[PDB]
Amino acid sequence: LGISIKVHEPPRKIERFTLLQSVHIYKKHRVQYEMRTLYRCLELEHLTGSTADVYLEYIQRNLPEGVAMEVTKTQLEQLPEHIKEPIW
Amino acid sequence: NEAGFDDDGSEFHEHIFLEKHLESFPKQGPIRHFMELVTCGLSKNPYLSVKQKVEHIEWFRNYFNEKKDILKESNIQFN
């Protein structure tokens, strides 16, 4: 389409906790569990509003059920109405 | 994240500027200090709506106006 992005991988975070195994005096035998949660974020650059909306629509229409989505858009803005030489 | 819950279509002046809801209170004193404190508390609260803030303000006003003997005996006047 004409976006030109890159590829990178943030560090992963794995959570591990220790719980009991039985219901009575059985503390010397513990069973632990993990929580693998990787991270794969892109970097969309040089995109307008309609193109970004179309890309988000295409991403959401084929988004699997095993992953997530964190949209962080940074819009542009010239100058507000009161920033030049305003006196209240 | 704004489809449905739009805070009844309000702006920022109704959430930040809450001075237009304090009329039956003085200007310099501990009562005004407590009112400013509760106003600052309700201002930085993105969990409640402005209607609930006004309800709490009027309830506190009625509670302070009900027990007037203690405020009169506290060596100060209540407006």
């Binding site: 975070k13 195994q21 929580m35 693998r36 988004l63 699997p64 059920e65 095993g66 992953v67 997530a68 | -």
Partner: protein, 132 residues
Amino acid sequence: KNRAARVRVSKGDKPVTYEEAHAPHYIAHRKGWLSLHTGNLDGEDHAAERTVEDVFLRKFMWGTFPGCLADQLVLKRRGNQLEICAVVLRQLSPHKYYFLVGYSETLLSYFYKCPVRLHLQTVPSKVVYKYL
């Protein structure tokens, strides 16, 4: 002697499948999970309600169909989707099967407030992998 959800071996007349003939220490190796959603990851809310809904759906599907489930249930939570991936034996009439499918779809869509579409997989007999 630590025994989990595995099947105890006795002689040679227990037709077990691939789900019942595996230990929980091989889930992320030679098995997998039945359901899949984003509630379990770190940093996300709404998980206890999802687990309660899942266990209630499993109990309902096991109680409504007497022995028609050859294995378990494979649920997929995709935003506002609840896809059921179950198997039904080839022992009854297809008309009753479609009737039950429609009834379950309507009940789930009207109870969980979510569009639900069922996808069945007809199996001629009980699923079996080994004679453990």
